[PDB]
Amino acid sequence: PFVPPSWAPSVFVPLTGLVLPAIAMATLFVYIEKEAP
Amino acid sequence: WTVPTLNPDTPSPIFGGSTGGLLRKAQTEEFYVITWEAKKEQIFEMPTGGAAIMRQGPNLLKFGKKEQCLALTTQLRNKFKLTPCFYRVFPDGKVQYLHPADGVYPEKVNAGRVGANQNMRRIGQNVNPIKVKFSGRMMSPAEI
Amino acid sequence: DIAGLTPCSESKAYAKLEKKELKTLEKRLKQYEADSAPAVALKATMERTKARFANYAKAGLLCGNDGLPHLIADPGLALKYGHAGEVFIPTFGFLYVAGYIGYVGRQYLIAVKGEAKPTDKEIIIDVPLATKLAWQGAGWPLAAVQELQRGTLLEKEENITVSPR
Amino acid sequence: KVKIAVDRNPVETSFEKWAKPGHFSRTLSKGPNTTTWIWNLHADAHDFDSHTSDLEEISRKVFSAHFGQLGIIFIWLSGMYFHGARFSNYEAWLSDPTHIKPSAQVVWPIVGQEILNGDVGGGFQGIQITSGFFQLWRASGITSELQLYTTAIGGLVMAAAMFFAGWFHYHKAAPKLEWFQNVESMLNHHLGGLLGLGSLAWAGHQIHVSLPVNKLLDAGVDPKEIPLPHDLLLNRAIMADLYPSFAKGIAPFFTLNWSEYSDFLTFKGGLNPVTGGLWLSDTAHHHVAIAVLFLVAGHMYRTNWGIGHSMKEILEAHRGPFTGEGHVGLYEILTTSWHAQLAINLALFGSLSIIVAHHMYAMPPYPYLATDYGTQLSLFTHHTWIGGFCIVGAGAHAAIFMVRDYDPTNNYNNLLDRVIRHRDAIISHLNWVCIFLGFHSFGLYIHNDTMSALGRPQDMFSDTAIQLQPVFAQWIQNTHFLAPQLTAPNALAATSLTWGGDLVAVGGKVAMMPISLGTSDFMVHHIHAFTIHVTVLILLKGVLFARSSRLIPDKANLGFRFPCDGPGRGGTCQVSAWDHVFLGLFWMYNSLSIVIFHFSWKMQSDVWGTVTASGVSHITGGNFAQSANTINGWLRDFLWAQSSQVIQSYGSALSAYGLIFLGAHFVWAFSLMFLFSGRGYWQELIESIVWAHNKLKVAPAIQPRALSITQGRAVGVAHYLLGGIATTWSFFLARIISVG
Amino acid sequence: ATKLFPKFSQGLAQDPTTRRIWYGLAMAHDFESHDGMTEENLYQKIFASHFGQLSIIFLWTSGNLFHVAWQGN
Amino acid sequence: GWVTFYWHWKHLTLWQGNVAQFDESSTYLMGWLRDYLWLNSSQLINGYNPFGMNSLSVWAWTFLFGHLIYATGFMFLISWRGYWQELIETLVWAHEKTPLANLVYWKDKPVALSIVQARLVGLAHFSVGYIFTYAAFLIASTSGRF
Amino acid sequence: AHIVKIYDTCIGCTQCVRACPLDVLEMVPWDGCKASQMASAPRTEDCVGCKRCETACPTDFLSVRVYLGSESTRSMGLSY
Ligand code: CLA
Ligand code: CLA
Ligand code: CLA
Ligand code: CLA
Ligand code: CLA
């Protein structure tokens, strides 16, 4: 019932805490460095 | 008196150089150039650190910011009784005379000068911030 | 008696603490010859310990389960049960001394304020005047009431500085 | 011409100024209007330079202020000798030094404080001292409280002389500036007279009193039956019996037959097996050599004859192709600026005090000093702290000179000018070195902590896991140890047992043994490098940027001690050279706190300990090597485990250390109020309090004011160091006295 | 030149230092100080922000319930 | 801190079954430091040691993690901007004078944190270490003892 | 840029103008005080916010007031 597989953490933990942070940091840094038209 | 023209090929005081000189800002944004006349060769203190010898007659130096130029302006006037003048120079060749703006040092009242940022009231007559709220941006009752 | 406490005079823990304290002092008194100055000193501390445990019990102090004297601070319980020398009387003793210091200091500041250089009389103390006020401070309580009743103790708000508001 | 030049009756001796507070200042003499005046009076009392622009007047004030200090020190020494003669167990300790604990402070029986009079032994009750005076007096050959009482009286006669000299050389015959500017003459007398004569005289006392008296003490002779020092000084037959060469008199000295005096002038090295201290015969031949060396050194500078050197000539001669003008201008700077002299003197004197701590512990010079762990730990820590404070002071006075005495007209293209011209290169490079050390020193501890917590001990830096051995220090130790047989043939033994070899045991306790150096030692030596490099970074930066920076170009006009230049330029808080000294103090405290903790744990873990049948049991059982590689290891096995003595001292004689331990934690936390706050808040709070005083007509004429920004910073750092150092002091003394 | 962030304060957007990044994050929820802020817009922004806070709280509770039901005992 | 210390110590003694310890040791500050902090910290600081680690290892690591953040706050709280601004200016010179490194440049001119910002960053570091340190000590002492 | 303002309480001491280390102020002819001169702030764009002018101002309360505002390369006194 609404139970994720055993590999969930082996994949979710890597993605959330490493991959997603990198993606977020990349887009955020770009926006701040972007200058108003 | 007329606005002076900066001669960029003026002799510079004798100095071996330092690590407190101009940075990339001088080539991209702007730099400042102080000029003065010396009646005798006198060693003086570089606001950027180090001793330097002013040359007889014309002298020219370049600083990264206006405060450094005015700092040297203070030493030359107070200690050597000289009368220096400085300018802001842009990377496109444009030169802007800065001090003394009217040829008369600011502390000496001069005609023609029009008052700016003056309030015909005492600070205790400023309005309460609630009155200047929701204006175009964050402002102070003093600005109104 | 009060709060379920027990007289130190009837507490067994109070008695055990006194024995424990005297046994430490005695274990040390042994390593020394009888007339040796060290021995005389340990004996005088043992006598002072015996007098303290006896004097505290005689004063009718109450002791908790820890066997240590507890002080009753309620004016009602202290007066009705004989425990006023613990907090009540001490309170009026301190209040008299503390008001004494305050009233004398206030009298000094007021006296030096009418001089040529009050600031000078604060760094260099006018000893004669200071001694005079120090002796006249015994009747401060009555003087403070007489000032409170003449309206001379406080300052008028109109004469006191404040921020813009 | 070097000559005595003075002014007669320069200043009148009256109490007129005593009754006029702030008379020395043009701003303070006007009297107080606010409370700031009181602080300013005390803060500017000994700043003669700011008092007057006359160098001669400043020099005369400095000279007399030094005589006042010398008089203070003499009273302090007389008190120590007096307390040793009237309030101590020295005579009993002389008979039984391995069991009786030194004590020279007795407390009066009041409010129950007599508990502090512990059972030190010898039929005596008092506070156990750790100054090492008992061992010093035994080394000097003192055997009676009469000798301690006589020296105490002498010290007071000397203190009275010092205070007289101070009054005389300021009010009666004040030396002129030319007199003080005789640097060549001053160095010749201080090297030849003060140092060489002082060492020669001490050799006289040691050879005629310290050596025979201590030889008899070590032979087991009772202190009562030992010949009095004069009996040995007036009889050669007694000295001849103890040392056969004395039968020949001083003939061998003038005939160059020095070898005959081999029985009292020796090069044994190592330690006396009976006492655990250096051989006095070795200390005698040493001070004799020091005396000769310094007597020669004091004949190098030119005075009133052509022979000798000119310090100005030597300096002007040392110039190279990479340093422009070179040492030109330094002679003028070091003969007209006291702050310049104080900067160099404080730097060397502090570095020296730190060197004394290491040398005195490894080569214990006094009898029965090595096995007195309380005294050993106290001495090392005390001299280490004195050194660190003096080093920070060196930085402050270097900045004071750069701000007040530096003149560019006298420093063009010289070493000083060229240093200021590449200051950004110096600070930026030092900045990187500090960051590299930090990560590669403290990062290793974090790695170990994480690996241990993650249950991966094999991935840690340890003598069993990954190893970081200090090979260079291990090679030097081996070289110094084997020195006696090859590079130092005459020496019987190596200078110290730390290098290696057999251990020396006195009273069943280890006096000294070899000290092994492994990964944990390598890690803590790099923490020291980091902490020192960073402290230098702050102090150096404060001195090089004292006159100006890219942020502030007229810092020199603002002065040495100023709060800031306003919130402009983003914020210019703490830009003054004084503020750099304020920050340097915290890092100096952090560095030395780590240094003394390292010494205590290493000594308690690998050196100190009872020697039993077939085996030495150390105090902490050698847990430094496997417990000092993690922060958790330090917090648990050092702070938490060794705090048991101070936390359990209540009800005993060490109860005072427990009270001071809490009181010190308090003072330290109280400093944070001043260090984290600003005067703007306090001034307003005072305004509302002043209102209550105004309402009851009890407001003071001297207006109450919040402390100045600089005073707020000075009060905070003072209470921080006081609290922190006192806390370690209570922890160290309670721990060592209990498990000594 | 004028950077895009923060869009609520041209002043900060015209700051050429790293302070712009810190202050843009520090003054994002101070609506009253935002450029061109009106009382009505102030209330509407807060109302929407309050729905956002509620959304986060309920997801936090759902997350807690899920991990207990999936990894606990 | 004082209120939570009081609550925890009174409950630890009640849970252990000897309220007398609090009743006799809470009347002096040495009692609080030795009978509450020092005594109840043994198992926590032994979460990981040269002999191995236990389930309390995360709390031992966190306890020290909080001490580090708390002390890092002291730097932003005691040291002020002026000193740092002058240090950064030297680094800006170093980067522009370093070959190859000067090829890459910054879009935002590096500056020291502001005065108000530094007070906030210091208070945050101070507050985070305060909470993390006590939370690590509280859970470890109660769980390990019971 | 920081906001610098002069108030009618100005006595024309010129101290603020002499204290300013960036030439943000000057003296202009006036008729409100005996000195017949009043301080003016025509170059506030060069102001850094040192507040030296306010420290030099002797009037109670200050006649010259500085309000820290938008930060620029000049306002931050950056030589880079
Ligand atoms: C300042 C805080 C404070 C507090 C919390 C208390 C609390 C207490 N007082 Mg009290 N008391 C105080 C100040 C205070 N007192 C002061 C400043 C005085 C000096 C006049 C007294 C004088 C006083 C007397 C004479 C008595 C108490 C008594 C008591 C206890 C019961 C009183 C009551 O019913 O209500 C609480 C009381 C107050 C909030 C204020 C004063 C107490 C009132 C005026 C006394 C009335 C007591 C009344 C007879 C109830 C008890 C009945 C019987 C057992 C005597 C109670 C625990 C009674 C007691 O237990 O004696 C054995 C008692 O008779 N107090
Ligand atoms: C009765 C003897 C006597 C008298 C009447 C005077 C009188 C005078 N001296 Mg003087 N002096 C004396 C002895 C005396 N001196 C001695 C023995 C020395 C050698 C140290 C000096 C060295 C000296 C110097 C260098 C100077 C004076 C100066 C002066 C004049 C003003 C300063 C002053 O005295 O204010 C009173 C000052 C004090 C009361 C401070 C006392 C200082 C003591 C020694 C410090 C003790 C600190 C203590 C040991 C530790 C405190 C720790 C803390 C925890 C309590 C004044 C007319 C000054 C001057 O010429 O005017 C500008 C000057 O610069 N004196
Ligand atoms: C043999 C010559 C000689 C000796 C032994 C000394 C010794 C000393 N001088 Mg000195 N000095 C000398 C020659 C000498 N000086 C000459 C020729 C000059 C002129 C160039 C100076 C100028 C000078 C200055 C400017 C200063 C000293 C200072 C000092 C003291 C530094 C404190 C210290 O480290 O010692 C430790 C202290 C002791 C060991 C106590 C013992 C001291 C006794 C009195 C030895 C006698 C010294 C004295 C010069 C002998 C003549 C006394 C006679 C006039 C009555 C020290 C005691 C400093 C000072 O202020 O001292 C007050 C200092 O500032 N001297
Ligand atoms: C400051 C260092 C110092 C001093 C003071 C002494 C002092 C002394 N040593 Mg010695 N020694 C020293 C260092 C010193 N030593 C060192 C470094 C070594 C290692 C090489 C030695 C090795 C050594 C040996 C092997 C011996 C001595 C001996 C002696 C004693 C006899 C000296 C002698 O024979 O005639 C020296 C000549 C003089 C001292 C001249 C005296 C001039 C007088 C005092 C002047 C009086 C003038 C006055 C106006 C008179 C009027 C008086 C008044 C009442 C009217 C003597 C007390 C001998 C000894 O022990 O005797 C038992 C001896 O055997 N020493
Ligand atoms: C031979 C050593 C020596 C000497 C001669 C001087 C001399 C001087 N120093 Mg200096 N200093 C030294 C070492 C020395 N220093 C060291 C080692 C440090 C590093 C900490 C400093 C750091 C330092 C600073 C930061 C400053 C000076 C300043 C000065 C000048 C004025 C002193 C003053 O302010 O008077 C007044 C002295 C006092 C009010 C003493 C204060 C009380 C002390 C600090 C409390 C210490 C704790 C105390 C022991 C607690 C006792 C117990 C308690 C319960 C009572 C003066 C010429 C000042 C200066 O140059 O002016 C611009 C200045 O700002 N020094």
Ligand code: CLA
């Ligand atoms: C525990 C508190 C603390 C800490 C950690 C530091 C740390 C530091 N201080 Mg400092 N300081 C402090 C308190 C502290 N201080 C206090 C209270 C004061 C007031 C007196 C000062 C005053 C002060 C001054 C005046 C100066 C410093 C300087 C420095 C730096 C020296 C250079 C260096 O070692 O770089 C290396 C960095 C470290 C050693 C930190 C170690 C961190 C670990 C090992 C790294 C882990 C990273 C991690 C894996 C990242 C991933 C996390 C994940 C979430 C992604 C350094 C980072 C100097 C400086 O600015 O630098 C030159 C400087 O001048 N401090």
Ligand code: CLA
């Ligand atoms: C029946 C009509 C009704 C109801 C149910 C609500 C309900 C709500 N309105 Mg609302 N409102 C209404 C009419 C209503 N409104 C009307 C007519 C107007 C126009 C005048 C408004 C205008 C309005 C505005 C402007 C706002 C709200 C907001 C809110 C939300 C408050 C957010 C909150 O604090 O969480 C829920 C609050 C509670 C559940 C109250 C209980 C709190 C107690 C103290 C907790 C105790 C719990 C218990 C003791 C222990 C629990 C233990 C365990 C279960 C954990 C909330 C859900 C705010 C919002 O929009 O948020 C998104 C807000 O900004 N309303």
Ligand SMILES: CC1=C(/C=C/C(C)=C/C=C/C(C)=C/C=C\C=C(C)\C=C\C=C(C)\C=C\C2=C(C)C[C@@H](O)CC2(C)C)C(C)(C)CCC1
């Ligand atoms: C005369 C004097 C001075 C005093 C000046 C002034 C104006 C003092 C102001 C006093 C004022 C306004 C007090 C206002 C309220 C005081 C109240 C309500 C009294 C509270 C006391 C209570 C409830 C008693 C508590 C207890 C008693 C019976 C005593 C003890 O048993 C302890 C306890 C708590 C149980 C100057 C100048 C400071 C200088 C100096 C001498």
Ligand code: SF4
């Ligand atoms: S916070 Fe204090 S030290 Fe910093 S700029 Fe303002 S007044 Fe100066």
Ligand code: SF4
């Ligand atoms: S704040 Fe500084 S730069 Fe600005 S007007 Fe005042 S003195 Fe001039």
Ligand code: SF4
């Ligand atoms: S300092 Fe004040 S009173 Fe004087 S000219 Fe400037 S604004 Fe006017």
